[PDB]
Amino acid sequence: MELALRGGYRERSNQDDPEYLELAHYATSTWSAQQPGKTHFDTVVEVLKVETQTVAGTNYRLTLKVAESTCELTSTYNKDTCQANANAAQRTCTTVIYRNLQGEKSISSFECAAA
């Protein structure tokens, strides 16, 4: 379920590995679908920061610029057709995704800063 440690995150660049963006989309679409009053998926405008912690499994702490997409929640989310319009409100959000050895992912946290 989680990897619990104070400190010990290592900084990664968002070009260090293409999977960071994939993980960002997984977290953002999954979380947005559960929010009360939402009609559309939120999507990832940009990965702003990547930090990881590994013991056996790994925490990916991703800081993201997020905006509402035009893809309805009744549709299947698509990582690259569900882009936000430049005029859509943006927020900075931070998510911790824990992945165990089986590759099972758990969103430990997903929090957005007020605009």
UniProtKB/Swiss-Prot annotation:
Which GO CC annotations does the UniProt entry carry? cytoplasm; extracellular space; vesicle
Q: What induces it?
A: Strongly up-regulated in salivary gland during feeding.
Which parts of this chain are annotated as the region Required for interaction with mouse ANXA2? 70-114
Q: Read off the Pfam families from this record.
A: Cystatin (PF00031)
Q: Does the keyword Disulfide bond apply?
A: yes
Q: Which GO terms describe its molecular function?
A: cysteine-type endopeptidase inhibitor activity
What InterPro entries does the database record attribute to this sequence?
A: Cystatin_dom (IPR000010), Cystatin_sf (IPR046350), Prot_inh_cystat_CS (IPR018073)
Q: Superkingdom of this entry's organism?
A: Eukaryota
Query: Listed disulfide bonds for this chain?
Result: C71-C82, C93-C112
Consequences of knocking out this gene? Combined, RNAi-mediated down-regulation of salivary cystatin-L and salivary cystatin-L2 in salivary glands strongly impairs the tick's ability to feed on hosts. About 40% of the ticks cannot feed and die. The remainder show much reduced blood intake, appear unhealthy and display strongly reduced egg laying. RNAi-treated ticks show an impaired ability to suppress the host's immune response to tick salivary proteins.
**UniProt tissue specificity:** Detected in salivary gland and midgut.
Tell me where it resides. Answer: Secreted
DNA-binding: is it a keyword of this entry?
Answer: no
Q: Where is this site: Reactive site?
A: G7
Alphabetically sorted, this entry's keywords are: Disulfide bond, Protease inhibitor, Secreted, Signal, Thiol protease inhibitor
Q: What does this protein do?
A: Contributes to the suppression of the host's immune response to tick salivary proteins and is important for successful feeding on hosts. Inhibitor of cysteine proteinases. Inhibits host immune responses, probably via its inhibition of host cathepsins. Inhibits host papain (in vitro). Inhibits host cathepsin L (CTSL) (in vitro). Inhibits host cathepsin L2 (CTSV) (in vitro). Attenuates IFN-beta (IFNB1)-triggered JAK/STAT signaling pathway in mouse dendritic cells.
What's the family?
Belongs to the cystatin family.
- Subunit: Monomer. Interacts (via loop 2) with mouse ANXA2; the interaction results in reduced activation of mouse NLRC4 inflammasome formation upon Anaplasma phagocytophilum infection.
What more the UniProt record tells us is: Decreases symptoms in mouse model of mannan-induced psoriasis-like inflammation by modulating immune responses. Vaccination of guinea pigs against the protein increases tick rejection during feeding, prolongs feeding times, reduces blood intake and induces visible inflammation at the bite site.
- Listed name of the protein: Salivary cystatin-L2
